[PDB]
Design a binder for this molecule. Sequence first.
Ligand SMILES: N=C(N)c1ccncc1
Ligand SMILES: N=C(N)c1ccncc1
Length: 338
Amino acid sequence: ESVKEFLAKAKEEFLKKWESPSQNTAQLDHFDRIKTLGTGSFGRVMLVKHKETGNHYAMKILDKQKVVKLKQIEHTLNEKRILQAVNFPFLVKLEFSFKDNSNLYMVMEYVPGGEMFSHLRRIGRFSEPHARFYAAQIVLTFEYLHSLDLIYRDLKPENLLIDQQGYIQVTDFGFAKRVKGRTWTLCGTPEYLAPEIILSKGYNKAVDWWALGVLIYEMAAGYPPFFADQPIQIYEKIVSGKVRFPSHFSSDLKDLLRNLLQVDLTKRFGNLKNGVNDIKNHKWFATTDWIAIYQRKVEAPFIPKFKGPGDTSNFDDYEEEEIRVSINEKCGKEFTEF
Ligand SMILES: N=C(N)c1ccncc1
Ligand SMILES: N=C(N)c1ccncc1
């Protein structure tokens, strides 16, 4: 009942913000730009500093014209509407949002420890206790998101930032969506796609649990289970129903992964009658104090090295491009609700 009442309040609070989203809560010249932290086909993330408070933030900047051309309008409206409505210890907090003639802006907390991906590639692979600590946070986060009828759809090490306490902060909700029932969009990253996405089926939250299997495998092995030079070859391996495990994997880890990497979505852990509890009660998680993880009372496997809230050393170097704002409004109709 404690979990039921927790999730009921979580949904109440989400729905109130979902039905009346915040809009236009800062403007660009409230900030100084410091450094580009990442770049994509239609957007960027920049470290910025608020000029009055001195606080640092990660500012996601999306080019409206490029969003339209890459057919990401609905997805970018999803991302902002969801981010301004959610609240969970392992989700990056949105602090401000606004738009101008050219761009959409989402200003969120800056997490200086960097992407899990960098740390995983630096060390090679995580020990099972280390992987399990992160996995437990994703399990709780998906329990939260799925109870709100939200599917995340982009789980991968690059989207998991490590904070000052060594805990995960999930970022990039660009593919997240509120879904009652099925949805159909081809999106994600090839190595993490569930078979039913590859096969163009109407799919559901079970794709997140498949991706968790991929993530746990990758954290514990150092590489994902389905790897190939071309996406088509990755997809053939994903749908095959065959995975090989390193001998150093524990038997419990292999058993959990076989049930998360279940190609038949109707047999996949997280999608059975007991839902998330088939995962939480699995022997691989026997040492996990779920409440202590939620309360952030467990000592983390490591704390990232950084000097302070403005340190960018755990992110990499990109060409610094202008934040140009047209004299004329672009795509106003498409982004009215942003
Ligand atoms: N890539 C990001 N959205 C990000 C968020 C927070 N801190 C750093 C990066
Ligand atoms: N003390 C623990 N590790 C613990 C394990 C499972 N459930 C609660 C606590």
